[PDB]
Amino acid sequence: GRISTGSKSLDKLLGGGIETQAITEVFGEFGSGKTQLAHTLAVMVQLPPEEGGLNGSAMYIDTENTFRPERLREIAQNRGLDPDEVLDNVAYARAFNSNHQMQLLYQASAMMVESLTDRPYKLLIVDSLTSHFRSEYIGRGALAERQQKLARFLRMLHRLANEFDIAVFVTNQATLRVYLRKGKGGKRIARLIDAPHLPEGEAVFSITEKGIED
Amino acid sequence: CSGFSTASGKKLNVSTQACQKAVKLFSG
Ligand SMILES: Nc1ncnc2c1ncn2[C@@H]1O[C@H](COP(=O)(O)OP(=O)(O)O)[C@@H](O)[C@H]1O
Ligand SMILES: *CCc1cc(CC*)nc(N)n1
Ligand SMILES: [Mg+2]
């Protein structure tokens, strides 16, 4: 299954949108649109496939204190959706450290089994995948433990994507890596990284009251 | 216990038993 990003241009670069049974990783500097894309996907996944969704629910793990329910309400209202229904279909959790981030995947798996209902979870967002690891290993970047912990976290994410047929979307400041940046005139640009046999070009997108869109 | 809530603010709970089952299925 594929979830639309809200932007026809970015969807075309991604082959239709982000895939289930896969980890899509968006990386870029602060202000590049990573969190806004996550918020938009959390609404789009709820739509029927003809409208870019998978008739599903979204799970959002926030490690940077940047999750905004009022933004989901605005995206829903500006796409003609009931905002209260959209908020009821998004489960969110703040992760305060890397241990908590991993523990929340066990709770996520329990919620996913229970939802297997007319609106199963189809999207898991981790925004961001590495913020806690970077802060916890300041002055200790050479320690193998940091890479080993991240490897265990990614292994669990792949297991969830495959067992529940869910798209995993992670941000970084990977089945598929996407780089976001700003060009001339504040143009927002996305391109694929280390993706042989996939589009090599760039896609321009915008951030508006509807979230991500052309 | 810091876990998940709906974006509307409703705490979503996972039983100790359901938690243990998930850890058992995915920890090994
Ligand atoms: N409700 C909104 N409506 C329009 N633009 C918004 C809204 N909220 C945030 N933005 C824009 O999103 C951009 C920041 O994107 P964000 O996803 O937070 O970046 P990153 O997570 O990569 O640091 C800013 O240009 C900001 O003005
Ligand atoms: C109370 C939150 C929580 C979740 C999990 C995994 C199900 N383990 C622990 N110890 N605590
Ligand atoms: Mg962000």
Numbering used by the authors:
A (entry chain A): 111 to 226, 228 to 284, 309 to 349
B (entry chain B): 2055 to 2064, 1226 to 1243
What does the paper say about this structure?
RAD51 is the central recombinase enzyme that catalyses mitotic homologous recombination, a key pathway of double-strand DNA break repair. BRC repeats bind the C-terminal ATPase domain of RAD51 via two conserved tetrad motifs, FxxA and LFDE, each located on eponymous sequence modules. As template, we chose a previously identified high-affinity shuffled repeat BRC8-2, which binds a monomeric construct of RAD51 (HumRadA22) with a low-nanomolar KD and inhibits RAD51 oligomerisation on ssDNA in vitro, and for which a complex structure has been determined.
SP30 is based on SP12 and contains a distant i, i + 18 linkage across the two modules. SP24 and SP30 were significantly truncated at both termini to remove residues that are unlikely to contribute to binding, as suggested by the BRC8-2:RAD51 crystal structure. A different linker (DVP) was used to cyclise SP24 and SP30 instead of DVT, which was used for SP2. No significant change in secondary structure was observed for SP30, indicating that the large cycle likely maintains a high degree of conformational flexibility. The pyrimidine core lies close to the surface of HumRadA22 and makes contacts with residues Gln213 and Gln217. Compared to the helical staples in SP2 and SP24, the linker arms in SP30 acquire different conformations, where both C–C bonds are perpendicular to the heterocycle core.
